[PDB]
């Protein structure tokens, strides 16, 4: 109730501010969806921790450890070894170095299917591409061979840093295509 009255006060002062609000209870969301000037298409959003909590653990009923797989993607962390860690802890912690990033696919991806683009990102770029913004426009997760990469398609990657995913934007089918070590994929390949 206190946070809804802050949203109302912000939106009363100026309607077009993007407001992002943390809500503790799901039934309280309806009250702010009904504010006249709240608009999810303008980017307003309510991070409902009750909805999200139960959603993450419910996916663990479908895939037993998935709440941990997925919650680690949404906090920024860098992998940092220490010699007392067992093998399983180092494997785990390297996995926690991952986050999910959005970046534009380079023109070298144009007219590939999503499966070719995902094979290419994984094998050459060391990037796990898992979804794309299909141009209104809509998110598609792991789309089948029927979906081509259109020009300037935004892709969704799992990677260790934003410095990694840039490689999808800089990759070039003539200039970089023979590179052995991914650190050399750089500088737009002009």
């Amino acid at each position: 109730a206190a946070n809804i009255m802050r949203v109302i006060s912000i939106k009363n002062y100026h309607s077009d501010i993007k407001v992002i609000v943390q809500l503790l209870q799901y039934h309280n969301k309806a009250y702010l969806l009904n504010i006249p000037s709240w608009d999810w298409k303008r980017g307003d959003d309510a991070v409902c921790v009750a909805e999200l909590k139960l959603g993450f653990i419910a996916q663990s009923c479908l895939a037993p450890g998935f709440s941990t797989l997925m919650a680690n993607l949404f906090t920024m962390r860098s992998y940092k070894p220490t010699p007392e860690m067992s093998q399983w802890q180092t494997d785990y912690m390297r996995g926690t170095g991952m986050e999910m990033y959005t970046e534009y696919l380079s023109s070298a991806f144009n007219a590939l299917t999503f499966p070719e683009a995902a094979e290419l990102c994984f094998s050459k770029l060391k990037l796990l591409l898992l979804a794309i913004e299909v141009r209104e426009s809509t998110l598609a997760i792991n789309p089948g061979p029927k979906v081509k990469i259109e020009n300037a398609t935004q892709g969704f990657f799992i990677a260790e840093s934003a410095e990694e995913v840039k490689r999808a934007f800089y990759y070039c089918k003539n200039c970089h295509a023979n590179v052995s070590d991914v650190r050399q994929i750089k500088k737009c390949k002009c």
């Binding site: 999200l52 895939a63 941990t68 997925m70 494997d91 990033y101 499966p115 094998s123 998110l139 997760i141």
Partner: protein
């Protein structure tokens, strides 16, 4: 204990206070200065707590579409049209549905598959994660996002999760693979 057990029952527990995670498990080597995400019960998918969600605020600012991605997965598909319908207060309206809307029954789902048997078992028998990834994507459109590996490789049924392994990461025949799939 059960007649024809115990620690083999699959559990997930929400914790109201993160530092209580140390009591949740034994054979564990507890330390109160370790943050929740490094603890064995969290690394095994046995614990959850609201504190790991907090950077949904910052990610909601930096890329709105990524917050919609996670949602379509974790909610199973709750679009803003359903949130609008629920905000009318009439309850969740439903019935028999047209083939035009029923087309959306092919959403992508997060699934888990075992390397113990079937066509992928060839990779579980000492192959590498990148071989498995390229094969599964090509033949089945199955996109692999991680592994769920036993901790005691030599005892317990506990398993840990490995998000996005390296291309040359070795597989074990007991590994389970997290995947995105359409069927």
């Amino acid at each position: 204990t059960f007649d024809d057990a115990g620690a083999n029952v699959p559990l997930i527990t929400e914790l109201a206070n993160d530092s209580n995670v140390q009591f949740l498990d034994q054979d564990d080597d507890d330390d109160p200065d370790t943050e929740l995400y490094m603890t064995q019960p969290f690394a095994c998918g046995t614990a959850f707590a609201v504190s790991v969600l907090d950077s949904l605020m910052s990610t909601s600012y930096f890329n709105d579409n990524a917050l919609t991605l996670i949602r379509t997965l974790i909610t199973g598909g709750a679009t803003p049209e359903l949130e609008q319908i629920l905000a009318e207060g009439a309850g969740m309206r439903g019935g028999y549905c047209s083939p035009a809307v029923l087309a959306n029954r092919d959403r992508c789902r997060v699934a888990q598959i075992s390397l113990f048997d079937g066509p992928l078992a060839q990779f579980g028998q000492g192959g590498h994660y990148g071989e498995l990834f390229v094969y599964a994507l090509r033949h089945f459109g199955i996109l692999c996002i991680g592994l769920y590996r036993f901790r005691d490789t030599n005892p317990s049924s506990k398993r840990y999760v490995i998000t996005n392994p390296p291309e040359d990461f070795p597989l074990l025949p007991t590994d389970q693979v997290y995947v995105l799939t359409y069927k």
